[PDB]
């Protein structure tokens, strides 16, 4: 409830305190790419970002904010949400090819890869914190799919 994050088209990330209008942290690299989605893991020691180079980088939520890599999906076109398990061991993402990808947060290994009806891609992927092993994906097709 004190600080917050923003990402922008100019390939940088800034962190502000609540109303200071001074960025206390600039996450900027040379070979970085902009991220259309940010999220914070439930263990609160990390927040991760879905970058434009078809990967997911992850940074600390403690001070001296510093940068694992989640790869195996093509999401360069659209900008796609990501969710986490309600225990904090699983991360789940969507794709431009109508399939979702679930990695294990503890080791960064791609566990499964489940396709979805509808030719159109899938962007918003959200997890149910109470009932475990339950995801919902949806996209430009229009229907709302309840994946296991």
């Amino acid at each position: 409830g004190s600080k917050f994050i923003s990402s922008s088209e100019d390939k940088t990330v800034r962190i502000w305190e609540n109303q200071i209008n001074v960025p206390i942290k600039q996450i900027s690299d040379t070979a970085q790419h902009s991220m259309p989605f940010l999220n914070v893991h439930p263990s609160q020691n990390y927040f991760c970002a879905q970058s434009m180079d078809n990967r997911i980088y992850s940074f600390s939520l403690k001070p001296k904010y510093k940068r694992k890599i989640f790869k195996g999906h093509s999401s360069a076109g659209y900008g796609i949400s990501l969710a986490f398990s309600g225990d904090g061991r699983y991360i789940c993402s969507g794709d431009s090819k109508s399939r979702l990808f679930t990695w294990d947060w503890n080791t960064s290994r791609l566990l499964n890869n489940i396709k979805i009806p509808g030719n159109k891609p899938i962007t918003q992927v959200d997890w149910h914190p109470q009932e475990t092993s339950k995801v919902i994906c949806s996209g430009a097709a229009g229907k709302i799919y309840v994946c296991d």
């Binding site: 088209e9 902009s34 360069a76 659209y78």
Partner: protein
């Protein structure tokens, strides 16, 4: 935050010899200040001495043959204690010549400065490393890596940024296409009055100067194939 080393003549270790070799491979023989900047606690002249006296592979470190050894006694007789001239006459380093002359005619404390340190044998190192030598090899790898200028590095950065900028520009168009509003792609602007757009015309079209044979049906077959490809990219999308 390092206190200043004003006198930099020391004992050549293994680390500094190896960084001098992998610096001479890249930087070359005649730039010595740029070599000696890479390894601290030594001087540009002492780097030059360590190359020309010891680390050079052209130098002759073997045992003396019998003709060589008699040649040494005779030359040391003719030219009294002119050891650079003698060592030039033997194609051997002068320190080797002096020590072997002492071995013929025969048959350092602590807290002293050794002047002959560049011509003497190296010291192998303790097993792990020292901390300053870890720092030295880190900055030495960092300086032996780079082969670019300022302009070229900025070009790498600008190409990556223009690439990601195009990706965002297509992302918003695909979102508005899903919404049902078709924003056409804007073109880059011309920096001068006759700057050329390359989809309007074949820009300097040269016709292939026809010959004796006839190309009507092959023209029609190509035109069919290209029109069908453009329609397929329009519907299905490549």
């Amino acid at each position: 935050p390092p206190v200043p080393i004003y006198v930099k003549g020391g004992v050549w270790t293994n680390v500094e010899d190896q960084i001098l070799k992998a610096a001479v491979q890249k930087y070359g023989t005649h730039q010595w200040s740029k070599v000696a900047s890479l390894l601290q606690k030594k001087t540009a002249r002492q780097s030059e001495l360590r190359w020309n006296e010891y680390l050079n592979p052209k130098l002759n470190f073997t045992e003396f043959s019998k003709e060589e050894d008699a040649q040494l006694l005779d030359l040391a007789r003719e030219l009294p204690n002119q050891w650079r001239t003698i060592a030039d006459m033997m194609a051997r380093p002068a320190q080797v010549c002096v020590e072997r002359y002492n071995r013929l005619l025969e048959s350092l404390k602590a807290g002293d400065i050794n002047p002959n340190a560049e011509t003497q044998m190296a010291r192998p190192d303790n097993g792990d490393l020292e901390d300053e030598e870890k720092e030295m090899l880190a900055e030495a790898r960092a300086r032996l890596l780079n082969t670019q200028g300022k302009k070229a590095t900025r070009k790498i950065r600008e190409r990556m940024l223009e690439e990601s900028k195009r990706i965002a520009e297509l992302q918003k168009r695909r979102e508005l296409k899903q919404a049902g509003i078709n924003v056409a792609i804007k073109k880059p602007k011309k920096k001068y009055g006759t700057d050329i757009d390359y989809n309007e015309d074949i820009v300097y079209e040269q016709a292939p100067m026809p010959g004796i044979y006839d190309t009507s049906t092959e023209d029609r077959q190509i035109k069919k194939k290209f029109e069908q490809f453009e329609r397929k990219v329009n519907r299905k999308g490549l």
